[PDB]
Amino acid sequence: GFFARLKRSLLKTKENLGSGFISLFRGKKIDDDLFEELEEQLLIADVGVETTRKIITNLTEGASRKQLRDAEALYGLLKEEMGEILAKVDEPLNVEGKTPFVILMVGVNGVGKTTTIGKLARQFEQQGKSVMLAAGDTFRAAAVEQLQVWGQRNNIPVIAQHTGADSASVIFDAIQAAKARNIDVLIADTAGRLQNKSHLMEELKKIVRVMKKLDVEAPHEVMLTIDASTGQNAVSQAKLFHEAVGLTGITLTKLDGTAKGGVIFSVADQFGIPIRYIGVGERIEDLRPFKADDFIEALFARE
Amino acid sequence: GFFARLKRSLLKTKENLGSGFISLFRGKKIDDDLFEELEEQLLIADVGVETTRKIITNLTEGASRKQLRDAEALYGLLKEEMGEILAKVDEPLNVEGKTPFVILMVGVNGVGKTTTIGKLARQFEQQGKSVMLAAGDTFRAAAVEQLQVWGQRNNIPVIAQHTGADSASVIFDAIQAAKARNIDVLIADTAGRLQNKSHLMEELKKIVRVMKKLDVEAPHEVMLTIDASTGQNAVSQAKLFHEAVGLTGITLTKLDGTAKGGVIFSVADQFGIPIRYIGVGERIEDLRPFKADDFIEALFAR
Numbered sequence: 280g281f282f283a284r285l286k287r288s289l290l291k292t293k294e295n296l297g298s299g300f301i302s303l304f305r306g307k308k309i310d311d312d313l314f315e316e317l318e319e320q321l322l323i324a325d326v327g328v329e330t331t332r333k334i335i336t337n338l339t340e341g342a343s344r345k346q347l348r349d350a351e352a353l354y355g356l357l358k359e360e361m362g363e364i365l366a367k368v369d370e371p372l373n374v375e376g377k378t379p380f381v382i383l384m385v386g387v388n389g390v391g392k393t394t395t396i397g398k399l400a401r402q403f404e405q406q407g408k409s410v411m412l413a414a415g416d417t418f419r420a421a422a423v424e425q426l427q428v429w430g431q432r433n434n435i436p437v438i439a440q441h442t443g444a445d446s447a448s449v450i451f452d453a454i455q456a457a458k459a460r461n462i463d464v465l466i467a468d469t470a471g472r473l474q475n476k477s478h479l480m481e482e483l484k485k486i487v488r489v490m491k492k493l494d495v496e497a498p499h500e501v502m503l504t505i506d507a508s509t510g511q512n513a514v515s516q517a518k519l520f521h522e523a524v525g526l527t528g529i530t531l532t533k534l535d536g537t538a539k540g541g542v543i544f545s546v547a548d549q550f551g552i553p554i555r556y557i558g559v560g561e562r563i564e565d566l567r568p569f570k571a572d573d574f575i576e577a578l579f580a581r582e
Numbered sequence: 583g584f585f586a587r588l589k590r591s592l593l594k595t596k597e598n599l600g601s602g603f604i605s606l607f608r609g610k611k612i613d614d615d616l617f618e619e620l621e622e623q624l625l626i627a628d629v630g631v632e633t634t635r636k637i638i639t640n641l642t643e644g645a646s647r648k649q650l651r652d653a654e655a656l657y658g659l660l661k662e663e664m665g666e667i668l669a670k671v672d673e674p675l676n677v678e679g680k681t682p683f684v685i686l687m688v689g690v691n692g693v694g695k696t697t698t699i700g701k702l703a704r705q706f707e708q709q710g711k712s713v714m715l716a717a718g719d720t721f722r723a724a725a726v727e728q729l730q731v732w733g734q735r736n737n738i739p740v741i742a743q744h745t746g747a748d749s750a751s752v753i754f755d756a757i758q759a760a761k762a763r764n765i766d767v768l769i770a771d772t773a774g775r776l777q778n779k780s781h782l783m784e785e786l787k788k789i790v791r792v793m794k795k796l797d798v799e800a801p802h803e804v805m806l807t808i809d810a811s812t813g814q815n816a817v818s819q820a821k822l823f824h825e826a827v828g829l830t831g832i833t834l835t836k837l838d839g840t841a842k843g844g845v846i847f848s849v850a851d852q853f854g855i856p857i858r859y860i861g862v863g864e865r866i867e868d869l870r871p872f873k874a875d876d877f878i879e880a881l882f883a884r
C-alpha cells in the first residue's frame with residue numbers, strides 16, 4: 280500500500296543505493312576495481328563495515344559461479360543479496376487478542392518516539408481498537424502536557440502523574456485503568472536521556488518488573504525507535520537497548536530526508552530484530568508496516 | 583484498452599481542461615494576464631485552489647528559467663505538470679494470492695458503490711477468480727433484495743441477513759463462508775448515510791475489528807467510491823473517510839457527463855491515495871483501472 284509514495288520518499292537514498300548503482304555499473308566489466316568502488320559506495324551510504332563485506336563477498340562469489348562478465352548483471356545479484364538481508368527482519372506487529380496488549384516504547388530523545396506513538400494510536404483506532412497512552416517520560420513537564428492535549432483532541436485516554444513521578448507507578452496505574460476500561464492496546468512512552476546510561480536502563484527494568492506483577496506476558500512488545508538520519512548512531516543505540524532490556528521490534532523513522540538509507544541494512548544484519556514500521560513522512564500512513572519486498576523494489580526501481 | 587472510448591468519455595471535461603487550453607494559448611504572449619486566465623480556467627473546472635496554485639507556480643517558474651515567450655509552448659509544460667500529479671497516484675489494485683482478498687467498499691449513497699462492486703465482481707469473474715459479495719447495507723431492504731437478485735442472475739453468491747441486522751455480523755459470516763468455499767475475492771458493501779444517528783464511522787470501525795478476528799490482514803483494501811459530478815463534495819468525503827478508517831484506494835465514478843474533471847487532480851494532490859479505478863460509463867469495461875499516462879494522453883489529445 281502507498282507503494283508510489285514509498286518510492287518518492289527514498290529519492291535521496293536512491294542517489295547512492297539501489298538505482299544509484301546503475302550509473303556505476305554502466306558500460307563496465309567485472310574487475311576488482313568495480314567491487315572496490317562498489318565497496319566505497321556502500322560504506323558512504325552507511326551500510327556498515329561488516330554488512331558491506333558480506334554483500335561484497337556474496338556478490339563476488341555469486342558472480343563467479345554464474346560466469347558473469349558484464350557489470351550490469353551485478354544489479355540483479357545485488358538486489359537479491361540486499362533483499363535477502365531485509366527479508367530476515369520482515370515480521371509485522373500483531374497486537375490482537377490481549378487485554379491489553381502492552382507496547383513499551385524505548386529510545387533516545389529526538390528520534391521521533393512520541394510522533395510514532397501518536398500515529399500508531401490513530402492507526403489502531405482506525406481499526407476499531409481502543410487505545411490508551413501512558414506518559415512515562417515524567418520529568419519532561421512540557422512533553423507530558425503536549426501529550427495530554429493531544430489525547431483530548433483525539434479522544435484517546437492519557438494516564439499521567441505530577442512532574443518527576445516514578446515512571447513505574449504511572450505505567451502501573453495505566454495497566455490497572457486499561458484492564459478496568461477494556462482497552463485493547465496500551466502504549467507507554469519512556470524517558471530518552473542516555474547521559475547516565477545506567478540510570479535509564481535500570482529505570483526500564485524497574486518498569487518491566489512492575490508490569491510483570493500485573494501480567495506476566497507484559498510487555499507484549501519492547502519496541503525501539505531509531506532515526507535513520509543519525510547513521511551508525513542508530514546501530515549503537517539499538518545495541519544498548521537490546522542488551523539491557525531485550526528488543527522485540529524496531530521502528531526506523533525519517534527515511535525521507537536523508538541520503539543515509541543504508542542504515543536499515545546495517546541494523547537488519549547485525550541484530551536480526553524484526554523491523555515493524557518505517558516512518559517516511561509526516562502523514563499517519565507515513566508510519567508504514569515494513570515489508571522487505573516492497574522496500575527493495577522501491578529502492579531498486581529504475582526511474 | 584478502450585482508449586478511444588476513454589477519450590470520448592472525457593469530451594465534456596476536455597472543453598475546459600487539456601485540449602481546451604489550446605484556444606487560451608493561441609496567438610498569445612506569456613504575461614501575468616495569461617497566468618491569471620489559466621488560474622480561473624483551472625478553478626472553473628474544479629482542479630482545486632491549492633492544486634491550481636502549485637500548477638501556476640511551477641508553470642511560472644519553469645517558463646522563466648527556460649525564457650519562453652510564446653504562450654503555445656506552455657501546453658507541453660502544463661501537460662507534464664498535470665501528468666506528474668496523476669502519476670503519484672497511479673498504482674493498480676492487485677487482488678491475487680489471498681484466500682480471500684477482502685475489499686471493504688465505503689462511501690455515501692448515490693456515488694456508485696453498488697454499481698462499482700457489480701462491475702468489479704464481473705471483471706474478477708472474467709479473469710477466472712471466484713467472487714463473493716456481502717450485503718453490509720442492512721437497513722436498506724430493497725437494495726439487499728436487488729443485490730440478491732443480481733447474484734442469482736450472474737451466478738455470484740451474496741451473503742445477507744434480515745433487515746436491520748448487524749453489519750459486522752453479516753461481514754463476519756461472509757468471511758467464514760468465503761473461506762469454506764475457496765473464494766478468491768470477497769467484496770463488502772457498507773451503509774452510506776452521513777447522518778450522525780447512523781454512526782457510520784463507528785460502524786465502519788466495528789466491521790474492521792470483526793474482520794481482524796478472522797484474518798489480521800483483512801481488509802486487504804479499504805476503497806472509497808466518490809463521484810466526479812459532486813465537485814469538492816468528493817474531496818470533503820475523502821477527508822472524512824480517510825481520517826476515520828484510512829483509505830488504501832479510491833474509485834472515482836461518473837467522469838462521463840461532467841465538465842468537472844479537475845476533481846481527479848484535486849483528490850490526487852491533497853490525499854496521495856492511489857486511484858485504483860475510474861468510472862466513465864454504464865458498461866462493465868467502463869469501470870477502468872486508472873492509468874495516469876493514458877488519462878493525460880486522452881485529456882490532452884487534439
Ligand SMILES: Nc1nc2c(ncn2[C@@H]2O[C@H](COP(=O)(O)OP(=O)(O)OP(=O)(O)O)[C@@H](OP(=O)(O)OP(=O)(O)O)[C@H]2O)c(=O)[nH]1
Binds near residue numbers: 471535558
Ligand atoms: N520527516 C519525518 N520526521 C519525523 C518522522 N517521525 C518523527 N519526526 C519528527 O521528529 C521530531 C521529534 O519527534 P518526537 O516524537 O517529539 O521525538 P522524541 O524526542 O523521540 O519524543 P519525546 O516527546 O521526547 O518522547 C519531530 O519534528 P519536530 O517536532 O522537531 O519538528 P516540527 O516542529 O517541524 O514538527 C517530528 O516531526 C518521520 O517519520 N519523518
Ligand SMILES: Nc1nc2c(ncn2[C@@H]2O[C@H](COP(=O)(O)OP(=O)(O)OP(=O)(O)O)[C@@H](OP(=O)(O)OP(=O)(O)O)[C@H]2O)c(=O)[nH]1
Binds near residue numbers: 725837
Ligand atoms: N454515467 C455513469 N453512471 C454511473 C457510473 N457509476 C455509477 N453510475 C450510476 O450512479 C447511480 C448510483 O447507483 P448505485 O450503485 O445504487 O450507487 P450507490 O447509491 O452509491 O450504491 P448503494 O446501492 O447505496 O450501495 C446509478 O444510476 P441511478 O441510481 O440513476 O440508476 P438506478 O436507480 O435506475 O439504478 C448508477 O447507474 C458511471 O461510471 N457512469
